[PDB]
Structure formats: structure tokens, C-alpha cells
Design a protein around this ligand. Structure first.
Ligand SMILES: CC(C)(C)c1cc(C(C)(C)C)c2c(c1)[C@@](O)(C(F)(F)F)C(=O)O2
Ligand SMILES: *[C@@H]1O[C@H](CO)[C@@H](O)[C@H](O)[C@H]1NC(C)=O
Ligand SMILES: *[C@@H]1O[C@H](CO)[C@@H](O)[C@H](O)[C@H]1NC(C)=O
Ligand SMILES: *[C@@H]1O[C@H](CO)[C@@H](O)[C@H](O)[C@H]1NC(C)=O
Ligand SMILES: *[C@@H]1O[C@H](CO)[C@@H](O)[C@H](O)[C@H]1NC(C)=O
Ligand SMILES: *[C@@H]1O[C@H](CO)[C@@H](O)[C@H](O)[C@H]1NC(C)=O
Ligand SMILES: *[C@@H]1O[C@H](CO)[C@@H](O)[C@H](O)[C@H]1NC(C)=O
Ligand SMILES: *[C@@H]1O[C@H](CO)[C@@H](O)[C@H](O)[C@H]1NC(C)=O
Ligand SMILES: *[C@@H]1O[C@H](CO)[C@@H](O)[C@H](O)[C@H]1NC(C)=O
Ligand SMILES: NC[C@H](CC(=O)O)c1ccc(Cl)cc1
Lengths: 678, 670
């Protein structure tokens, strides 16, 4: 009766994760509740032999030697920290021992070929990765960086995260790792311009990582960190002599960083196999502790250490001889293994079962450091794919920082003050044209107005009015119109200006031509020549516009920094109409019109002295065509040179139309209206 | 008694790496039998007890525990060939005060002495090649390098040590790159940043993929250099079995591997009295047919180190060692720290537990790796052996593709044609001056003032001259003679215009005052205010020469030189004010001359009015000078068009104002 069956244990009281500060009172209690019950093990008694591994495998090797080579034979081993658990689980197959880790999360321990006799109540760390990928997909992040300490737990967690992000279309664009000094990888992260960083390292290493982060200025509006939620709630305020940054300086470096953890405690008020709810368990464990749970390490993982003892006892119960066990016999080991494998029971941490992948807790908690205190921002279940968001995440500027400063394509527009001014000038120009037209057609033959050819001057003013009202299409940029309505503004430029120039220059070119060739007379030929000129011009323009329609085209410029804000670097791109082939059709058109203008100037100079009275004012017509010719021959190539500058081209076209259209109307009509009706 | 040592080696033949252990036993026995013949340890004798560790972390720890419990009082640990068990054993030495000395562990993680304070290593580690790479870079002036690291512990630690080795030197890291399974999702970034020297830290089977992707980006040839680790198996490139092998060999040809040197080439006598070549012959005739391991000399030197350390530790002096004596472990550690002697692998000396040894370089030729130099770490010297190292180019690959500044030149044929046209303008102006001066007595010329005409011909003659000073860029003019010529041209242009038009406005003043020597005084008074304006200009801002550089992007014609176009021009703090003042004064003079000319044309002077000519010339000048001012100041970033416009408008204006004044009189005289 009461034959003592001993178990070995390694509780880390310090180091990278001081889980033993609360996981030891968890088993010290669990051994009393399991020994007080008679239905569990009446013939045996579970006793504990424990040491302090301190997360250091060097101490764990010496203590495993002292455990495996002393007289009292141990039936099972219980390591904590991940490195100690890996060492023990890989060494134990030489002694035919079962290993049962209560606080090991390394995903590398899931394969049964390398650790064939290992079990754990702690869930695998691959549960953090679906939550991270969900938070990356929710906020549209596609490029993340990683920095982790080169421990197998973090390496395997990062490999699983890499596989998960590769599945979801996310890319890990930068990767850093360090053994004991993170200055170099943090400086490389700052040089490489990493925005969304994922840190996988212990708290004692996290303090140094973030001290170098503060000295490197790798925090603020542009960067966001994803840490692990297993740290103490004040790890950045703890005095540490190995790191320089003052706690008030370090509180700024850790700000707004997101952390994920697992619940590990059943929130339902149902009673477990031990006949106690989760709240009574927490209250009893807090009574067994020397200090508040907020300052005791490993308080979150104590239910796992509680359930590991019960799983061990329930597995030894179904196997009922245990004193004949020795490190040279594997039958008792196989029996206890097949009894542990098939274990399923309702413990304090929920439904305890030892599956192969190590995934039995579904809920993951997400929280954020807001003002020096953690706040829970939501939960996530990956087995059902449901995210319960609380909507309490605070960001600087009210939005999550986006990585990879993109390109914003903005258009350059015409300064609307100038366009409005020139439009007002053109409106006054067409009202002046209609006033002079009403004048010259009201006095059709009442007086000597008929001595000057009246219809030629009338339709000259008509062409002038069209060419002057053709400035509105030439000024309509993408600011007022949009793309769908745009291709008709291009033809409203071309037809109006071409027909206006043809009708307002051929009509006072044919008059000069007829003065020359009959005065150095016929009433209808003066209209036949201008009709032929305008018809042939319209033919030569329609062949171009129909054979090669004019369509929009964007010319893209080099990137510039619009740092009038703190936002994206834009690139400006101009939009304007062009043909599939350009500067050949427009060049030939300009050359032909320039030849007509030169011939007009020549004929107006050759006939400046004739004193005919069949035509009244050919000299003012000659001056008008000289001015029109000089303005158009100056401002035709200028708008071809300044095409990539919208305001200069528009001013040099619109003012070279406005001035010419004012000068021709004045020179023709104010002498006649002045001498006729003074 | 005997002084016992615990040797931990893979001895069995079931493991593939046991070929190392069975290779070094022929060597260690050569050291053991020697020590007992010369009797370095006089009262004691050394015995090394071997234990099989098949590199399983389970079997090796079992052997270590069984040697601790059932074995003699071991004073030291010796060996450890596989790093997985070697780190496990080395981290726990503090619990038994055992000092381990390895001869085949090369991972750099064992270099830090906060985690492994009792570990010693006779073979140069993986991160001991960085000081050699530094001296190789300083030998070829490669001051800018990129890196390609595989994200695992050993290679990331080598890279993190390299970052601290180059600190303080002039060498720069352009971009650090990392990968885990696909190596050339990162080689494209090394091609985009255009690094020419690449330091690689990756394993053997990743190197084939790295090189087969560097073949795609064409990151090979006469302008790229690879420096990867050389501890790879011989003929490692034949074992990769989708990528063609010929392209792999063409892409990898020329890489420089860096790895430790097995034996010393010096012929001086070692601590054992034999030279390295004699020891090599003794080793090659000691083992019959066992495969030769490259760690045999390091095991020989490790045994001699152990012997000398035990000698010094026993002369420093508790006689037994129950694994609890901390003082004896500390004495053995301090005696091991002071090891300094010449053995078959060079000078054995430790610096913080790590060996200071020689590192050789091997360049890849056709189908082999030949030795090209050696770096001695104790003397800190690099000796590249001659005639063996080569490059596919005539010179060693240079980093930092050259950038150079070149001026955006005003095309010489355009300047030539317009300078040949303006001299025709000047000779026709001089012919008109001859016409004016020969026929000065006829009434057709005496009706006009013949001196107010030879002032306007002077104005046009020197304003034609101003075209050249707009074309002098800097292809053939220096700093100061350009800076002063920039104001010589503005004096020339402004006084030419002011004389040329003030003279005809004075001629019109005279005819307007008569009809209702004094003509020169008012053009002198106009030049007075003009020179006052330009002296107030020069006293404030003398138009200092500036130069704008932009668009460092454009490619060359193909000689691989990034040409940076930049261009020089005259500016100041604010040219708008000065140009506006000058043009406003000149326009006021223009309008007040046209007014006075129109008053003369209102009354129809019979044969010398010429006010229609004043009107036409003033109109043409008023439009063309405004156009030339507004277009030259908006095409400043393309100077060829700027010059072709500012010269053409000057030609046109200064020819019209001459002809419309001079030709109507010559056409009626002849
Ligand atoms: C076109 C038109 C207005 C007929 C004209 C054109 C010229 C140019 C020499 C520039 C070709 C011209 C005149 C008139 C003058 O009668 C004057 F009035 F300008 F003197 C003159 O001889 O020059
Ligand atoms: C083992 O313990 C369970 C309660 O957990 C009990 O019901 C059972 O009776 C025990 N073993 C046997 C075979 O009685
Ligand atoms: C580290 O912090 C301490 C205390 O603020 C300061 O005295 C010291 O100068 C810092 N490090 C350096 C560069 O000395
Ligand atoms: C479990 O414990 C509670 C607490 O007193 C008790 O009321 C209940 O009867 C117990 N049930 C069993 C099955 O032990
Ligand atoms: C020890 O192991 C052997 C293996 O065959 C087994 O036959 C024997 O019953 C075992 N004895 C015990 C458990 O003491
Ligand atoms: C443990 O149970 C699982 C459940 O399917 C099974 O796959 C595995 O083979 C079992 N273990 C042994 C040793 O049979
Ligand atoms: C170590 O030696 C002392 C002195 O003889 C002895 O009392 C002790 O039992 C020994 N311990 C071990 C582990 O050998
Ligand atoms: C060896 O180490 C000691 C400290 O234990 C140190 O004082 C001494 O300078 C070192 N000598 C060397 C590195 O040769
Ligand atoms: C190489 O060594 C030879 C000695 O045989 C020497 O003459 C030659 O100058 C050396 N080459 C260089 C580049 O120093
Ligand atoms: N669940 C506790 C576990 C313990 C360990 O894996 O050593 C752990 C893992 C990772 C961190 Cl950062 C902190 C603690």
C-alpha cells in the first residue's frame, strides 16, 4: 500500500521565461488533490522531485544527470522551457521514459519521429500565425519584415508563418536573426525601410531589442510591431542593467504594438474532472502564491501544469505494475504511452486531449499597448474563421500605418483663374464681333459701305467669332470634364479653330488677291474663291481627322516629392490630345497655312499703292493680314515647343487668338463706323 | 598516475560523418606515442579514453553521462565533431568544471564566452574569415559591397560579425539581402541596386540555385565578383540534379571561396621537432587505407595543447579531480588561455578561446579550385600568390559604376550657322553705313539727319554682335571670363537698343519741333539713365554664374558610364525685378517715341515723314522682343532652342529696323 511512484520535474524560476514561479504551486496542488482521491490510484502515491532549470540547457543537463542517475527511479519527466523540453524529449528515448511538458510551445516538437515519447498540454505556437495573417489581411498589408532570436521555437514558428503568408498572398520581404545582440539586425531593418515588423524573442531579449530600437528611431507613425503576448504587463518598466535606455525613454519605443496570446482557461462556469471551476482554481492558486499574480511569472500557464498531472494520473490509472519499471524495459513505457495517447478529459483548461498537431484551444486574444497599459482589441477563432472585434484600437491619425509608400498619379491642370479670364475675354470678343456685324449689315447699302465688299467683311467677322470662341475647348482640361465626355472637346478645338481661321483669313485674302490680279471686278467670284479655299481646307482637315482621329494621351513625368503633407510620393502626369502620328500632319498643316500667309503679305505689299474705288479699304485689310500672319507665325511653333507646359501653351494660343481677333475687327470696322456715322 | 582525457568522437562506420573520426585517430596516436617517448609529463602519463558519439543528441549525451559516471576522473574533454551534440556538451561544462577542446567544431555560435565559457577550439571558426575578406577587399580597392545571407543561425551570425568587422573602415554595405528557400527573389534586388561585389553566406545546395538564378539576371562575367564560403564538398556542383550544368559552370566561373588552411607551408621545426611535411608523410604512412580527414593536423595540435596545458597546470600547483574542484578547473582554464607555440598548423595561440589561424582563398577556374592566397591572422597579413589569380576582364572588377558630369552643350553647327548669318548682317549694315557716308551731300540724304543714321547703324552693328555672347557655354570658356562676359553682353545689348532707337526718336523730335548737336544730347541723356539702371543692377547682384545638375539616370552609348547631365546659366537672387525695370523703361521710351512719331504722321510731312516706318519697326520690335523675353525665360532648361530663338529674334528685329529706315532712300537714289 502507498508505494511511492516518483516523477521528475524541471521548473524554470528565472531566465527567459520564469514559468516555475507559479507552475510549481500548480503541480504541488494537483498532487494533493489526486492523492486525496481513492478512485484514482489507491495502491500508489505520486511524488515530485524537482530542480530549477532557469531556461538554461546547461543547468538542465546537469540536473537531468542528477535525475537519471540517482537511486529513486522516475516514471515520467516534466520539463518546462522549450530548450530544456527539446533536450529532455530527444534524450529520453535512450532510457525509455515518457516526457510530459506543461509549458513548451515549440512547433518543432510535434513530429513523432524525432520525439517519439513526448506529450504536452501546452498548445503549439502555430496558433498565433492565423491571427497574424488575419490582421495582415484586414489592414491590407502585403509586405512584412521579421526579426527573431535563433531558438528552434522561434525558427519553427517563423517557418509556419512563412508558409501561412505564402498561402494568403503575403510576402516576407526582409528577414533578420540574432543570437545574443540585436543591434546589427535592428540597424539593418532601419536601413532597409521595414514598416510592419514581427518580433519573435523572449522578454529579456525584447528589452535590449527595443532599447536599440529607441536609439535607432524605428518607431512612431511609420512602423508597427507584432510581439508575443506572454510577457509581463510591465516588462518595459523593469529595471535592467544590461540595457541603457531609461524606462521613460523606452516607454515611447513600445507604443501601439500589437500582441497575440491564447486564452488557455475555460471561461465557462462548468466544473472540470477535479470538480472545480476556473474561477475557484484561480482564486486558490492566488491564495497559494506569495505575491500578486500580476507580478508572478507563469501565472497564465498554470492550468496546463495542473492538467498535466491529472493526465499523467489518469493514464497510469488505466494501466493499473509500476515498481518493476526500469530504464532497460520498454513494455511499461509502451503501455503508459498508449494510455496517455488515448486520454480525453475535461480539465481546467478545457477539453484536454493529446492530438498529434497540438491544437485544442481555438480562441486567440489580441491586445495593444495604449498609453503604457494593454487593452484587448479583439478575439479570433481560426477553426470557424470568426473575428470578434471590439473597435478600441487607437492609431496615430486614426488609421493603421500602410507600408510601401506607393505612387499616386495626379494630373496637372490649367490654373482656372487664367482660363476664366481668357474665357471672359473671348466672350467680350464675340459680343464685339456681333456688334460690328450688326453694324456692317444694318448699313448694307445705305451709304458707301457697299463700296467695300460687305459680305466678305461680314463673314470675316463670322470666322473671327468662331476662332475666338474656339478657346473654350482649347482650355477644357480634365478638371471640368472627365474622361468619358473628353474626345469631343478635341474636335470642338479642331473644327472651330480650323474653320474659323480659314473663313477669317481666306475672306480677306481673296479680296487682296482680286485687287492685285485685276488692278495691276466680278461680283460673284469674290465668293467663289473663298468658298474654294474653305472647302479645300475642310477637305484637308477632314481627311486628317477621319484617317487618324485625335485621341487623349498622357505624358508621364519623373517622380517628385509632394511633401506639402506627410503623405505618399506622387508622380505628375499631363493629359492632352494627340494623333497616332503627330508633327507630320500638324507640321504640313502649319506649313501650308504659313505659305498662304506669306503670299497674302506679299500681295498686300504689292498693292498698297493702288487707288481703286471698286473696293474701298484694301489697305486696312493688308494691315490686318500682316498682323494676323506675324502673330500666327510666331505662336505656331512656340506652342509646339512649349507643349509639355500647359499654362504657357494655353496662354500663347489663347492670347495670340484674342489679340489677333481684336486687331482685325478694329482695323476693319472702326474706320468705317467712324467715318460713316461719326 | 594516469591523466585521463574524455575523447568524444563518432567512431562507428554506420554514420556518414564517422569518416572524420576514423581519419583523425591515425594522427592523435602519432601525438600520444611521441609524448611518452620524450616524456613531457615525467611522473604521470596521458591516456585518452574514446567514446562513440554518433552525432545523435540522444546517444552522445548517453555516452557523456556514462563516461562521467563509470569512467575515471577525467581532467579535460577532447573532440566533438558534430555541432548538435558538441553545443549540448559544451554548454554544460561549467557544471563539472571540465574544459573542452574541440578540433572540428566550426560553427560561430560557440565563439561567445557568456554561453560557453569553458569551450576552446583549435580549428578556425566560420566567422574567422571576415578579417581575411577585409584584407582581400582592401587589396583591390573594393570599398562598396553587397551581401546575400541565408537565414539560419550560422550564416546570420557570420553576417552579423561581418557587420562589426567592417565598422571603422571605409568599406560600405550597399544592401543586405536574405532568403530561406528561394534565393533569387532576392538576387533581383542585388541586380536592381547594381552591386558588383557580392559576399555570400549560404549552404551547399543553395549555391547551385543562387548561381542558376544569377545566370538569369546576368550577375556574372567581367563586372561581377562572388565571394562565397569554400568549405563545400569538392565537386559540389556535379551533385545538383531543371537547370543546365553548362550555364551553371559559366555563371560560377571565377568565384573566390574562403576557408581555413589544413597544414602550414612553412619549413621551420614545430614543437615536436618535425616539420609539417615530415608530419604529413608520417601521417600518410601511419594510416593504411583510411580516408584522409582534413582535421588531422588540428587534432595533433590539440593533443600537444592538452599536454602543454597539463604540464603548466601541474607545475602551477587537490591531486584528484572529483568534478567538484572549481579551483583546479580554473587553473586548467587559465593555463589553457596562455597556449602559444608553433605546431604543424602554424602558430597555435588563442584569443578569447578562438584559434588565430591562417585562412586560404581558392578561385574557381575551368573545373577546379586552385589556391590563390593566404591570410595569416597573427601577423594580420594577406599574401596573394602570383600568377594563379585571374579575372575575365583585363582589370579586377570595379564597384561603383562611374558617374561623371558633362555640360549640356549648345550644338556647334547651329551656333556656326547663326554666327555665319550675323556676320552677313554686320557686313550689310556696314555697307549701308558706307552708302550713308559716301552720299552724305545729296538732298535725299541731307533731308534726314545723317548722324542720327550712323548712330542707329552703330546700334544695329553692335546688337548683331551680341548673338555670339549668348552661345558661349563652357565647352570653351572658363569660370571668370564667362561670369564677366555675362554682363558684357547685357551692356552691349541694352546700349545698342537704346542708341538705335533714341537716335530715330531724336530725328523725329527735330522734324516735329521745326514743323510744330542737340539731337545727340538727348540720346546721351537716355544712355545716362540706362547706365544708371545697369550700375544699380551691378552694384546689388552681379549675375553670379550658377549650375544646375539634374536627372542622374540616363544611360551612356554603351561604354558603361552613368553620364550626369548638368548645365550652367546666369542668375541672381531675383532677376524678375531687374528685367522688369529694364523692359519697363525701354517700353516707356518706345511708347513715347511712337506718340511723337504719330503726331508727325498726323500732318503729312511730304518727303521725309518716315513715321509709317517708325510705326512698323516699333510694332515689330514691341512684339518680337516681348516674345523673345517670354520664351527664352520659359525654355531655360533646354538651351539650344533658347539660343536659336533669342538669336533669331535679334537678327529679325535689328534687320527690320535697319532696312525700313535705309532701303527706301537707296531705292529712290538709284
Ligand atoms: C503688309 C503691309 C502692311 C502691306 C506692309 C508690309 C511691309 C513689309 C516691308 C514689312 C513687308 C511694309 C509696309 C506695309 C510699308 O508700306 C510700311 F508702311 F511699313 F512702311 C513698308 O514699306 O513695309
Ligand atoms: C481510474 O479513475 C477513474 C476516475 O477518473 C475511475 O472512475 C476508475 O474507476 C479508476 N480506475 C478503475 C479501473 O477503477
Ligand atoms: C548609456 O546611458 C547612460 C545613463 O544615461 C549614459 O551615462 C551613457 O553615456 C550611455 N552610453 C554611453 C554612450 O555612454
Ligand atoms: C463537487 O464539489 C462540489 C463542491 O462542494 C459539491 O457540491 C459536489 O457535490 C461535488 N460533486 C462531485 C461529483 O464530487
Ligand atoms: C522488462 O522488459 C522485458 C522486455 O521483454 C519484459 O519481458 C519484462 O516483463 C519486463 N519486466 C519488468 C517490467 O520488470
Ligand atoms: C496514437 O493515436 C493516434 C490516433 O490515430 C495514432 O495515429 C497513433 O498511431 C497512436 N500511437 C501509437 C504509438 O500507436
Ligand atoms: C567526492 O569526493 C568526496 C571526498 O572523498 C566524497 O566524500 C564524495 O562522496 C565524492 N562525490 C562524488 C560524487 O564522487
Ligand atoms: C587570459 O585570460 C585572462 C583572464 O582569465 C586575462 O587576464 C589574460 O590577459 C589572458 N591572456 C591571454 C589572452 O593570453
Ligand atoms: C610576385 O612574386 C615575384 C617573386 O618571384 C615578384 O618578382 C613579383 O613582383 C610579385 N608580383 C607582384 C604583383 O608583386
Ligand atoms: N507558453 C510559454 C512559452 C515557454 C517556452 O516555450 O519556453 C513561451 C514561448 C514564447 C515566449 Cl516569447 C514566451 C514564453
Amino acid at each position: 500500500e502507498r508505494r511511492a511512484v516518483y516523477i521528475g520535474a524541471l521548473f524554470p524560476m528565472s531566465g527567459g521565461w520564469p514559468g516555475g514561479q507559479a507552475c510549481q504551486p500548480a503541480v504541488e496542488m494537483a498532487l494533493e488533490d489526486v492523492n486525496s482521491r481513492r478512485d484514482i490510484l489507491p495502491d500508489y502515491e505520486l511524488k515530485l522531485i524537482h530542480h530549477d532549470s532557469k531556461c538554461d540547457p546547461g543547468q538542465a543537463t546537469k540536473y537531468l544527470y542528477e535525475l537519471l542517475y540517482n537511486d529513486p527511479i522516475k516514471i515520467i519527466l516534466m520539463p518546462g522551457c522549450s530548450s530544456v523540453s527539446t533536450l529532455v524529449a530527444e534524450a529520453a528515448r535512450m532510457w525509455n521514459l515518457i516526457v510530459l511538458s506543461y509549458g513548451s510551445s515549440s512547433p518543432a516538437l510535434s513530429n513523432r519521429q524525432r520525439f517519439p515519447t513526448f506529450f504536452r498540454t501546452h498548445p503549439s505556437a502555430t496558433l498565433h500565425n492565423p491571427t497574424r495573417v488575419k490582421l495582415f489581411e484586414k489592414w491590407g498589408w502585403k509586405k512584412i519584415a521579421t526579426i527573431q532570436q535563433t531558438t528552434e521555437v522561434f525558427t519553427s514558428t517563423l517557418d509556419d508563418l512563412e508558409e501561412r503568408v505564402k498561402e494568403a498572398g503575403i510576402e516576407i520581404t526582409f528577414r533578420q536573426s540574432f543570437f545574443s545582440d540585436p543591434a546589427v539586425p535592428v540597424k539593418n531593418l532601419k536601413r532597409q525601410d521595414a514598416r510592419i515588423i514581427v518580433g519573435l524573442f523572449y522578454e529579456t531579449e525584447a528589452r535590449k531589442v527595443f532599447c536599440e530600437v529607441y536609439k535607432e528611431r524605428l518607431f512612431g507613425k511609420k512602423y508597427v510591431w507584432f510581439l508575443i503576448g506572454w510577457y509581463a504587463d510591465n516588462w518595459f518598466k523593469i529595471y535592467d542593467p544590461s540595457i541603457n535606455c531609461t524606462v521613460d525613454e523606452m516607454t515611447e519605443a513600445v507604443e501601439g504594438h500589437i500582441t497575440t496570446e491564447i486564452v488557455m482557461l475555460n471561461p465557462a462556469n462548468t466544473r472540470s474532472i477535479s470538480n472545480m471551476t476556473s474561477q475557484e482554481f484561480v482564486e486558490k492558486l492566488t491564495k497559494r502564491l506569495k505575491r500578486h499574480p500580476e507580478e508572478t511569472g507563469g501565472f497564465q500557464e498554470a492550468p496546463l501544469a495542473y492538467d498535466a498531472i491529472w493526465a499523467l494520473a489518469l493514464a497510469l490509472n488505466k494501466t493499473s505494475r509500476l515498481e518493476d519499471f526500469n530504464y532497460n524495459n520498454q513494455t511499461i513505457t509502451d503501455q503508459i504511452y498508449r494510455a496517455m495517447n488515448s486520454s480525453s478529459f475535461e480539465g481546467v483548461s478545457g477539453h484536454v486531449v493529446f492530438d498529434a498537431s497540438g491544437s485544442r484551444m481555438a480562441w486567440t486574444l489580441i491586445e495593444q499597448l495604449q498609453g503604457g497599459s494593454y487593452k484587448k482589441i479583439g478575439y479570433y477563432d481560426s477553426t470557424k474563421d470568426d473575428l470578434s472585434w471590439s473597435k478600441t484600437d487607437k492609431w496615430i491619425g486614426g488609421s493603421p500605418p500602410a507600408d510601401q509608400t506607393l505612387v499616386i498619379k495626379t494630373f496637372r491642370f490649367l490654373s482656372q483663374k487664367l482660363f476664366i479670364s481668357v474665357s471672359v475675354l473671348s466672350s467680350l470678343g464675340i459680343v464685339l464681333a456681333v456688334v460690328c456685324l450688326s453694324f456692317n449689315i444694318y448699313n448694307s447699302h445705305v451709304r458707301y459701305i457697299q463700296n467695300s465688299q460687305p459680305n466678305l467683311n461680314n463673314l470675316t467677322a463670322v470666322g473671327c467669332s468662331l476662332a475666338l470662341a474656339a478657346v473654350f475647348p482649347l482650355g477644357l482640361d480634365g478638371y471640368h470634364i472627365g474622361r468619358n465626355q473628353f474626345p469631343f472637346v478635341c474636335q470642338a478645338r479642331l473644327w472651330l479653330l480650323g474653320l474659323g481661321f480659314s473663313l477669317g483669313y481666306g475672306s480677306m485674302f481673296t479680296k487682296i488677291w482680286w485687287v492685285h490680279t485685276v488692278f495691276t471686278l466680278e461680283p460673284w467670284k469674290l465668293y467663289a474663291t473663298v468658298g474654294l479655299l474653305v472647302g479645300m481646307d475642310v477637305l484637308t482637315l477632314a481627311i486628317w481627322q477621319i484617317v487618324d482621329p485625335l485621341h487623349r494621351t498622357i505624358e508621364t513625368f519623373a517622380k517628385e516629392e509632394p511633401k506639402e503633407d506627410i503623405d505618399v510620393s506622387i508622380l505628375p502626369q499631363l493629359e492632352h490630345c494627340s494623333s497616332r502620328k503627330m508633327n507630320t500632319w500638324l507640321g504640313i498643316f502649319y506649313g501650308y497655312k504659313g505659305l498662304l500667309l506669306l503670299l497674302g503679305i506679299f500681295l498686300a505689299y504689292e498693292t498698297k499703292s493702288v487707288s481703286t474705288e471698286k473696293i474701298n479699304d484694301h489697305r486696312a485689310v493688308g494691315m490686318a493680314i500682316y498682323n494676323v500672319a506675324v502673330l500666327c507665325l510666331i505662336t505656331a511653333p512656340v506652342t509646339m515647343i512649349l507643349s509639355s507646359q500647359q499654362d504657357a501653351a494655353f496662354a500663347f494660343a489663347s492670347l495670340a487668338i484674342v489679340f489677333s481677333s481684336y486687331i482685325t475687327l478694329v482695323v476693319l470696322f472702326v474706320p468705317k463706323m467712324r467715318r460713316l456715322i461719326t | 598516475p594516469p591523466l585521463s582525457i574524455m575523447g568524444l568522437m563518432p567512431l562507428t562506420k554506420e554514420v556518414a560523418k564517422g569518416s572524420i573520426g576514423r581519419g583523425v585517430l591515425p594522427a592523435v596516436e602519432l601525438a600520444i606515442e611521441q609524448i611518452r617517448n620524450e616524456s613531457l609529463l615525467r611522473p604521470y602519463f596521458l591516456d585518452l579514453r574514446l567514446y562513440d558519439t554518433e552525432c545523435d543528441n540522444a546517444k552522445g549525451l548517453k555516452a557523456f553521462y556514462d563516461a562521467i559516471k563509470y569512467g575515471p576522473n577525467h581532467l579535460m574533454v577532447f573532440g566533438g565533431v558534430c555541432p548538435s551534440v558538441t553545443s549540448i556538451i559544451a554548454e554544460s561544462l561549467q557544471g563539472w568544471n571540465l574544459v573542452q577542446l574541440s578540433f572540428a567544431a566550426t560553427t560561430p555560435v560557440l565563439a561567445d564566452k557568456k554561453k560557453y565559457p569553458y569551450f576552446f577550439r583549435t580549428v578556425p571558426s566560420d566567422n574567422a574569415v571576415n578579417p581575411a575578406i577585409l584584407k582581400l577587399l582592401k587589396h583591390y580597392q573594393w570599398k562598396r559591397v553587397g551581401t546575400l545571407t541565408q537565414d539560419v543561425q550560422r550564416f546570420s551570425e557570420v553576417r552579423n560579425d561581418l557587420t562589426g568587422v567592417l565598422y571603422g573602415e571605409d568599406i560600405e554595405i550597399s544592401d543586405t539581402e536574405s532568403f530561406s528557400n528561394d534565393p533569387c527573389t532576392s538576387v533581383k534586388k542585388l541586380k536592381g541596386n547594381d552591386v558588383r561585389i557580392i559576399l555570400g553566406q549560404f549552404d551547399q545546395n543553395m549555391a547551385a540555385k543562387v548561381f542558376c538564378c544569377a545566370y538569369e539576371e546576368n550577375m556574372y562575367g567581367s563586372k561581377y565578383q562572388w565571394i562565397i564560403p569554400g568549405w563545400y564538398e569538392p565537386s559540389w556542383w556535379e551533385q545538383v540534379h531543371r537547370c543546365l550544368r553548362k550555364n551553371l559552370l559559366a555563371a560560377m566561373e571565377g568565384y573566390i571561396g574562403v576557408d581555413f588552411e589544413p597544414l602550414s607551408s612553412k619549413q621551420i621545426k614545430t614543437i615536436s621537432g618535425k616539420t609539417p611535411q615530415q608530419y604529413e608523410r608520417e601521417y600518410n604512412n601511419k594510416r593504411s587505407g583510411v580516408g584522409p580527414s582534413k582535421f588531422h593536423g588540428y587534432a595533433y595540435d590539440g593533443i600537444w595543447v592538452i599536454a602543454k596545458t597539463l604540464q603548466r597546470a601541474m607545475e602551477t600547483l587537490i591531486q584528484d579531480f572529483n568534478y567538484t574542484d572549481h579551483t583546479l578547473g580554473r587553473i586548467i582554464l587559465n593555463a589553457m588561455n596562455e597556449t602559444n607555440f608553433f605546431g604543424v598548423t602554424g602558430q597555435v595561440v588563442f584569443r578569447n578561446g578562438e584559434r588565430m589561424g591562417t585562412i586560404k582563398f581558392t578561385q574557381f577556374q575551368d573545373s577546379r579550385e586552385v589556391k590563390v592566397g593566404e591570410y595569416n591572422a597573427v601577423a594580420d597579413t594577406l599574401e596573394i600568390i602570383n600568377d594563379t589569380i585571374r579575372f575575365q576582364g583585363s582589370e579586377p572588377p570595379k564597384d561603383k559604376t562611374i558617374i561623371l558630369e558633362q555640360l549640356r552643350k549648345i550644338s556647334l553647327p547651329l551656333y556656326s550657322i547663326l554666327s555665319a548669318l550675323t556676320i552677313l548682317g554686320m557686313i550689310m549694315a556696314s555697307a549701308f553705313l558706307f552708302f550713308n557716308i559716301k552720299n552724305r551731300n545729296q538732298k535725299l540724304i541731307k533731308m534726314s539727319s545723317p548722324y542720327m543714321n550712323n548712330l542707329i547703324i552703330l546700334g544695329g552693328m553692335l546688337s548683331y554682335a551680341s548673338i555670339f555672347l549668348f552661345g558661349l557655354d563652357g565647352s570653351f570658356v572658363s569660370e571668370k571670363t564667362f561670369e564677366t562676359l555675362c554682363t558684357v553682353r547685357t551692356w552691349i545689348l541694352t546700349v545698342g537698343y537704346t542708341t538705335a532707337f533714341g537716335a530715330m526718336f531724336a530725328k523725329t523730335w527735330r522734324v516735329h519741333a521745326i514743323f510744330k548737336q542737340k539731337l545727340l544730347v538727348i540720346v546721351g541723356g537716355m544712355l545716362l539713365i540706362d547706365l544708371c539702371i545697369l550700375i544699380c543692377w551691378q552694384a546689388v547682384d552681379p549675375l553670379r554664374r550658377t549650375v544646375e545638375k539634374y536627372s542622374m539616370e540616363p544611360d551612356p552609348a554603351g561604354r558603361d558610364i552613368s553620364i550626369r547631365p548638368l548645365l550652367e546659366h546666369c542668375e541672381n537672387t531675383h532677376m524678375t525685378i531687374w528685367l522688369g525695370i529694364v523692359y519697363a523703361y525701354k517700353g516707356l521710351l518706345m511708347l513715347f517715341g511712337c506718340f511723337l512719331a504719330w503726331e508727325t504722321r498726323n500732318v503729312s510731312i511730304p518727303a521725309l515723314n518716315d513715321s509709317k516706318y517708325i510705326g512698323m519697326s516699333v510694332y515689330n520690335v514691341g512684339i518680337m522682343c516681348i516674345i523673345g523675353a517670354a520664351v527664352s525665360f520659359l525654355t531655360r532648361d533646354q538651351p539650344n532652342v533658347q539660343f536659336c530663338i533669342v538669336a533669331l529674334v535679334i537678327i529679325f528685329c535689328s534687320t527690320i529696323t535697319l532696312c525700313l529706315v535705309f532701303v527706301p532712300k537707296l531705292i529712290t537714289l538709284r
